[PDB]
Amino acid sequence: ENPLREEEWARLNETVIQVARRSLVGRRILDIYGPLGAGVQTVPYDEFQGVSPGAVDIVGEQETAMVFTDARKFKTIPIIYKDFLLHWRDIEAARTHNMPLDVSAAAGAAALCAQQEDELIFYGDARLGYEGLMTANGRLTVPLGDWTSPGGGFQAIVEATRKLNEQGHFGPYAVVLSPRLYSQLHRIYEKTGVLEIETIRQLASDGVYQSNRLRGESGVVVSTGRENMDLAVSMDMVAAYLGASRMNHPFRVLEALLLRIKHPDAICTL
């Protein structure tokens, strides 16, 4: 029983999608495990330090240990949601008298929803208990300090890169910083006419990124492939109708999301 006809429905969906796409940073550095459908609500989790140095042997074969999940176990996919409200007289008006049909409330809801999602990815839930990129285990901490020198925004990144490489884990890197220092990273006068951020960018090869969801003085570097960091969606950000009540109209925008870090070797923090 949809109150709204097709065009208005489409405008609402377009608005929520647009605000989400603009305001999301996490889903630009991670890759998604395909849309599983709404029904499934569990996924398998990980494999890591199954260290199997490897085998040589001439026309034959030794008996090394096959690589497999460290310990098979599952996790459950949370749900994150926001709810906005409409009025029946406004809908009647937009139907006849004055015809924009304001959709501001949907945009507010979508902004809140996307902020919650990105906070989830960059910071796990304390109450329920998940893994946060800032709070995972085995994060390979590197001292992100001693900045505010003309050079110094490069030393920390290169140290983090050697730390990833030492663990034999490399590839096209990616970097995300808190807004204060990302802005402050325009200490451009390194030696010649090139931006310190730009030389960092050619080192990382997948783009330094801005994400306000960080705290004051933090940032990460990762390895943008699969098999290291993954993101599992059950259903994307859609708008749902909760049913009439008091002749008003309530509404709700839904997300069913969970990341799973297969390989917690691709991390750096402060």
């Binding site: 630009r28 550095i29 709404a38 969606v233 994307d236 950000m237």
Partner: peptide, 11 residues
Amino acid sequence: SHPLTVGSLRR
């Protein structure tokens, strides 16, 4: 099943 809507936001 249901198609992706928001998108992938490449890699």
